Symmetry: D2
Subunit: 30 residues, 4 copies
C-alpha cells in the first residue's frame, strides 16, 4: 500500500543521491 509507495520513493531518492555524488566527482576532475 502506502508503505510500498514510500519504499519506491526512497529508492528513487537513493538513486538520485548516487547521481549527485557522481556529478560532484565529475566537477572534481576538472
Amino acid at each position: 500500500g502506502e508503505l510500498e509507495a514510500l519504499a519506491q520513493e526512497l529508492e528513487a531518492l537513493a538513486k538520485k543521491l548516487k547521481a549527485l555524488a557522481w556529478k560532484l566527482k565529475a566537477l572534481a576532475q576538472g
Copy 2:
C-alpha cells in the same frame, strides 16, 4: 582532494539509503 573525499561520503550515504529502501520493502511485505 577535498571534493573527492566529499563525493566518497555521498556515495556511501547513497548506499545507506538503498539499504534503508530495501528494509522498507521487506517491511511492506512482512
Copy 3:
C-alpha cells in the same frame, strides 16, 4: 557556482528524506 548549485540539490534531497521519514512515523503510529 556549480558547487553551490550541487549543494542546493543536496539540501532539496535531504528535505524530501525528512518529509518521507515523517510519513513513515505517521503510518507506524496510526
Copy 4:
C-alpha cells in the same frame, strides 16, 4: 517498532546530508 526505528535512521541520514551540503558550500567559497 521497526518502522519507527527506520524513520529515525532516515532522519539522521538527512541531517548528515545537510552537513555535507554545508561543507560543500564552505569549499565552494573557501
